[PDB]
Amino acid sequence: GIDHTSKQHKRSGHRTAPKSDNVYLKLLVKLYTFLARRTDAPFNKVVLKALFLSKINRPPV
Amino acid sequence: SQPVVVIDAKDHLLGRLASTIAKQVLNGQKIVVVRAEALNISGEFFRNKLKYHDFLRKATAFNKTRGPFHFRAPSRILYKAIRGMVSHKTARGKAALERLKIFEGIPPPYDKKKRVVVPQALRVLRLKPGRKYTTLGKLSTSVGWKYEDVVAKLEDKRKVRSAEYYAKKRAFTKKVSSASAAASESDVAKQLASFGY
Amino acid sequence: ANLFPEQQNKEIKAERVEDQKVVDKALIAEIKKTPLLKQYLSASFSLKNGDKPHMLKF
Amino acid sequence: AESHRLYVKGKHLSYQRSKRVNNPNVSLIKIEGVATPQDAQFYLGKRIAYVYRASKEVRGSKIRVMWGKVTRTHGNSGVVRATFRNNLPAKTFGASVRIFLYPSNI
Amino acid sequence: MAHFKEYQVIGRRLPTESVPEPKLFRMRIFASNEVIAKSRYWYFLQKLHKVKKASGEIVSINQINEAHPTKVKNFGVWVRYDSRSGTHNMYKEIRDVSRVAAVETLYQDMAARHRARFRSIHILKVAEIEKTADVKRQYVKQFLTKDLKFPLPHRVQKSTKTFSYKRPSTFY
Amino acid sequence: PKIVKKHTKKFKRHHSDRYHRVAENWRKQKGIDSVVRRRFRGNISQPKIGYGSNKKTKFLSPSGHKTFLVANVKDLETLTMHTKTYAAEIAHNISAKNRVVILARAKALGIKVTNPKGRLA
RNA sequence: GAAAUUGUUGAAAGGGAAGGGCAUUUGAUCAGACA
RNA sequence: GGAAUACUGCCAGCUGGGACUGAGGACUGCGACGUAAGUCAAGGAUGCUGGCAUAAUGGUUAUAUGCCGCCCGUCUUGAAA
RNA sequence: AGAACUGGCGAUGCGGGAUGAACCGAACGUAGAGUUAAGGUGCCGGAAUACACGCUCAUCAGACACCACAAAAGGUGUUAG
RNA sequence: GCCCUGAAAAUGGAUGGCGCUCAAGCGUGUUACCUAUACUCUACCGUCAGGGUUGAUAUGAUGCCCUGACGAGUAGGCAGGCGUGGAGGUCAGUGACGAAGCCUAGACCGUAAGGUCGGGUCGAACGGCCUCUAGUGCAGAUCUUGGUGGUAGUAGCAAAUA
RNA sequence: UUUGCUCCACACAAUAUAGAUGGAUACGAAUAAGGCGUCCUUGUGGCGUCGCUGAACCAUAGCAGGCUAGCGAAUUGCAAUGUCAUUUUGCGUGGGGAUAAAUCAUUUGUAUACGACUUAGA
């Protein structure tokens, strides 16, 4: 074995898709994974990660 | 590469001959040990007698017919030594002891055959001179073997026959070597002796 | 296969015997030039008792 | 003539093993007349055959053959290893095999 | 440890501004390689002078072969060694042809007869004895007489095959 | 393709031969002094994820097709595009008048039926 | 009309237990893309 | 005085034997060879020949053989107990 | 019986110490090849009845640390200073 | 230094055994060799991390492919799955030309939970898939009820006159 | 009541290998000593020679092994046992050969739990 520095097989604690089953939200992630991967602009990575956020982390503005 | 190998066990050390036989009879070689009454064993006499009378004490308490059997013949002392060096409680080891026969004296099936001698287990190559050794015949007849005088009698009834055989074969090679010298001055002997022959 | 045809193999092709003859008749004007060679090619090879194939030179 | 042999009759000693464990894929073959690792380098790659006799006849033959080759030398005394196609059945410990000379480099 | 090789090692305390020329120290050391020899320098030097490896350096390490490695020499060895209880001083003698073969013979002769390892032996002086009256050990004096002929009585023939077909004869 | 089955044996339960109440369906030994859970030498081997099959040759028969299950002539028509890929195994309760239909439709379309000799008569 | 357990027939094995794991010989048996 | 040979180290020196593996599946890249055409051992195997397509070779299963294998559950610092 | 520092067992198989919760080596997906660790190479048992210098003869010799014990006191036993 | 004396315990016994004496012992040294689930290289599975990919028919993005690293584990945590009794939906599913069951050292698939098929038996109902729901998965509890064994053709069936 | 059985002769089938493929090739004693030769008054004798491995010695020339009384040897395609020897046991063929006991039941008591033992009976 190796002398393990840090923990093996640890999930990064960020969600990669919404917990929801909203179809009309799943199409917004099909739009912004295209944008954030094929546009160098950092606005689209922000709105991509913000569409996964749960209702507690998504307070009314 | 002989199928049957007859070993002249005169002046062989007991445990060193028994270890180059257990390794040989486990490789499929029918080995016949012969005249085991002249086997040797290192250490002086009463030291080896005391190492046997320690073995005679070890018997089963509750029924003495159960425990270790103290075989007394010199064929069976060497057979006790060999059987320790074979895994004899299996089918490989039991078949490896069905390729071994040991006698004391040379029986009539084996008096006319050649006898070979294991050089790495002889006394006169291994034991430093001046050491005290022990003949297995004198040891075994002191712990209760009864037929030492018989084997010494039957061996002298066959040494005088083998000496009778050798004198016939010595006079054979006398009249062959005195005849082949006329067949040496040829051209084929001049043709063959340059070939290492 | 259930015919047992023997497709022209029991007898010999005509021209095959001459080429084996030409090669043989050209070689035996060299084999017989040295002594004991025609007896050496006519005997097969086998291992005797002390034949150790890693020690002897061929 | 009664000269026919083109092999060298080795014995089949054991499987490749440690103490208390054995590995039946590699068998140890003791070739006759071989006493060092150098001159056991001659027999590397030459193929063995374990010829045995069975009772039920297949292909019109009562003798069946198990093939296999000699792989690498074993320690210090001319023992070699061998990898048979189907491994030798372990009832053949101390049984004559025949090392041929088929892939030859002489 | 292994087949010995005699080195010389020159060492030196590291200089400072007050004394930028310290004195060099030479040792003739029998060790097995260049690394063990540089360790045995800082062993015997540190038992003699106020200097460690950290405080000093090594000027030069060379190997010393012999001018006559084909001539027997009655060597005379001074050696100290730690027993199981106490420390002693000794004087043995070796006969061997090479100086480093005598130290190999010495370490075997001490590890057998006194059970003294390499770690508990300090050699002191190995010097060739020039004339045959300084030899003072009986087991060397027998090889120093005129007409030295002795026989070898009990020869053994080491076998290759495991069986033999005649009783062997030890005659020489 | 050359398929390689890792561990062709069955993974029977521990002590499944010794006792009749335990079955040969595999169950992990959740004991504390178990010599199967502790992975001793000479005891049986448990399912690990290492024994998985190759992802190109998983679910393939030794013939080389993935087995389907048909139940009528309509369930054959999902296989006429994929004849090399999928075999066809008629289900265990299709009656004998309905087997000789879909054994005969598949002879037309060319689907390699797996059990044609069932309920033949 | 399951199992425990039992009877007949068939196969095989058996020196103070039986069973199991890896590997192959032998017998039985099963097999399909090219078939 | 002149060599030589050890021993250690180096070579992008040449050369022979054996074993295990052949993953990937249009091309693209790197680099040699070449005047060019292209060729290549250069981003993972092909060429040739023979045998078998019946039981060759595989699967299961019984037994034999070599080596290993204590009875599970459990409370327990520690259970084959 | 009780604390300090770490390491381990518990919770852990593997190779070695014949055997063993803790010692030595080393921590584990399923396989093939190669090389080793700790320990070993007369035979059981895979591997040198190798090589080299010595010491030792025991009428309870002695042989793998943990580990399965031995002491003061001795001896013109032998060897060395 | 080695050896010996000092050195005495109860079933028969233990450098592991056999055995060993220019050792197969001890001290030391030099090499060669054996081998673990460790190390290196390769394959495959899984897990994690990072990338590529709405060109375009699996249109599609629960995917697709590229890359690298890692994998022990009781108490415990979470995830992905298999199985069962019933419910809504669907396959215009299967079925007296034999459904369910049961048997089967017969075959196949899956790492596994388990799924599928052939044969025998048998006689009236039962499945796949998407979801809902729970009286849902047994080797144990001196478990509960029912059934059956070994012991075992054994102990024994011998007071009260025949 | 020539069916039984015994043995010796090929025509068999058949089963089984702890593992045949040139040769198991013979003094004894001693090792700080012997072998062989050779003469000699015959010895615990002179003289020669040898060892330092059996890697020896003996065998071995052909179709898996010939012949007319010098010829037969091909295509078994480039390797695939490329065989073949034994130990047994039944069945034919003919050549001979021999012509019984034990146990149970009945009995005895030198024996005895039952078996066993020891006895007797055409």
UniProtKB/Swiss-Prot annotation, chain A:
Note: There are 2 genes for eL18 in yeast.
Protein localization: Cytoplasm
Source organism of the structure: Saccharomyces cerevisiae (strain ATCC 204508 / S288c)
Family from the record: Belongs to the eukaryotic ribosomal protein eL18 family.
Modification sites for N6,N6,N6-trimethyllysine: K49
Subunit structure and binding partners: Component of the large ribosomal subunit (LSU). Mature yeast ribosomes consist of a small (40S) and a large (60S) subunit. The 40S small subunit contains 1 molecule of ribosomal RNA (18S rRNA) and 33 different proteins (encoded by 57 genes). The large 60S subunit contains 3 rRNA molecules (25S, 5.8S and 5S rRNA) and 46 different proteins (encoded by 81 genes). eL18 interacts with NAP1.
Signal peptide stretch: none
Top-level taxonomy: Eukaryota, Fungi, Dikarya, Ascomycota, Saccharomycotina
Function, in words: Component of the ribosome, a large ribonucleoprotein complex responsible for the synthesis of proteins in the cell. The small ribosomal subunit (SSU) binds messenger RNAs (mRNAs) and translates the encoded message by selecting cognate aminoacyl-transfer RNA (tRNA) molecules. The large subunit (LSU) contains the ribosomal catalytic site termed the peptidyl transferase center (PTC), which catalyzes the formation of peptide bonds, thereby polymerizing the amino acids delivered by tRNAs into a polypeptide chain.
From-to range in the entire protein, with total length: 2 to 62 of 186
Protein name stated in the entry: Large ribosomal subunit protein eL18A
Curated annotation (Swiss-Prot), chain B:
Keywords: Acetylation, Cytoplasm, Isopeptide bond, Phosphoprotein, Ribonucleoprotein, Ribosomal protein, Ubl conjugation
PTM-bearing positions, type Phosphoserine: S42, S180, S184, S186
Pfam families linked to this entry: Ribosomal_L13
Cross-link annotation Glycyl lysine isopeptide (Lys-Gly) (interchain with G-Cter in ubiquitin), location: K175
Origin superkingdom: Eukaryota
Primary subcellular site in the record, as a coarse category: cytoplasm
GO cellular component: a single term: cytosol
Record-listed N-acetylserine modification sites: S1
SUPFAM superfamilies to which the protein is assigned, alphabetical: Ribosomal protein L13
Post-translational modification: N-terminally acetylated by acetyltransferase NatA.
GO molecular function: mRNA binding; RNA binding; structural constituent of ribosome
GO biological process assignments: cytoplasmic translation; maturation of LSU-rRNA; negative regulation of translation
Annotated compartments: Cytoplasm
Annotated family: Belongs to the universal ribosomal protein uL13 family.
Further details from the record: There are 2 genes for uL13 in yeast.
Assembly, per entry: Component of the large ribosomal subunit (LSU). Mature yeast ribosomes consist of a small (40S) and a large (60S) subunit. The 40S small subunit contains 1 molecule of ribosomal RNA (18S rRNA) and 33 different proteins (encoded by 57 genes). The large 60S subunit contains 3 rRNA molecules (25S, 5.8S and 5S rRNA) and 46 different proteins (encoded by 81 genes).
Protein name per Swiss-Prot or TrEMBL: Large ribosomal subunit protein uL13B
UniProtKB/Swiss-Prot annotation, chain E:
UniProt GO MF annotations: structural constituent of ribosome
UniProt-listed GO biological process terms: cytoplasmic translation
Keywords: Cytoplasm, Isopeptide bond, Phosphoprotein, Ribonucleoprotein, Ribosomal protein, Ubl conjugation
Cross-link (Glycyl lysine isopeptide (Lys-Gly) (interchain with G-Cter in ubiquitin)): K125, K131, K149
Phosphoserine: residues carrying this PTM: S32
PANTHER family tied to this protein: 60S RIBOSOMAL PROTEIN L18A
Family: Belongs to the eukaryotic ribosomal protein eL20 family.
Function (record text): Component of the ribosome, a large ribonucleoprotein complex responsible for the synthesis of proteins in the cell. The small ribosomal subunit (SSU) binds messenger RNAs (mRNAs) and translates the encoded message by selecting cognate aminoacyl-transfer RNA (tRNA) molecules. The large subunit (LSU) contains the ribosomal catalytic site termed the peptidyl transferase center (PTC), which catalyzes the formation of peptide bonds, thereby polymerizing the amino acids delivered by tRNAs into a polypeptide chain.
Protein name, UniProt field: Large ribosomal subunit protein eL20A
UniProtKB/Swiss-Prot annotation, chain F:
Domain of life: Eukaryota
Keywords noted in UniProt: Cytoplasm, Phosphoprotein, Ribonucleoprotein, Ribosomal protein
InterPro entries to which the protein is assigned, alphabetical: Ribosomal_eL32, Ribosomal_eL32_CS, Ribosomal_eL32_sf
Phosphoserine, modified sites: S34
GO CC list: cytoplasm; cytosol; cytosolic large ribosomal subunit
Alphabetized GO MF terms: structural constituent of ribosome
Gene Ontology annotations of biological process type: cytoplasmic translation
The UniProt record lists the keyword Membrane: no
Keyword Oxidoreductase: no
Subcellular location: Cytoplasm
UniProt xrefs under SUPFAM superfamilies: Ribosomal protein L32e
PANTHER family: 60S RIBOSOMAL PROTEIN L32 AND DNA-DIRECTED RNA POLYMERASE II, SUBUNIT N, RIBOSOMAL PROTEIN L32
Known function: Component of the ribosome, a large ribonucleoprotein complex responsible for the synthesis of proteins in the cell. The small ribosomal subunit (SSU) binds messenger RNAs (mRNAs) and translates the encoded message by selecting cognate aminoacyl-transfer RNA (tRNA) molecules. The large subunit (LSU) contains the ribosomal catalytic site termed the peptidyl transferase center (PTC), which catalyzes the formation of peptide bonds, thereby polymerizing the amino acids delivered by tRNAs into a polypeptide chain.
Protein family per UniProt: Belongs to the eukaryotic ribosomal protein eL32 family.
Protein name stated in the entry: Large ribosomal subunit protein eL32
The organism of origin for this protein: Saccharomyces cerevisiae (strain ATCC 204508 / S288c) (Baker's yeast)
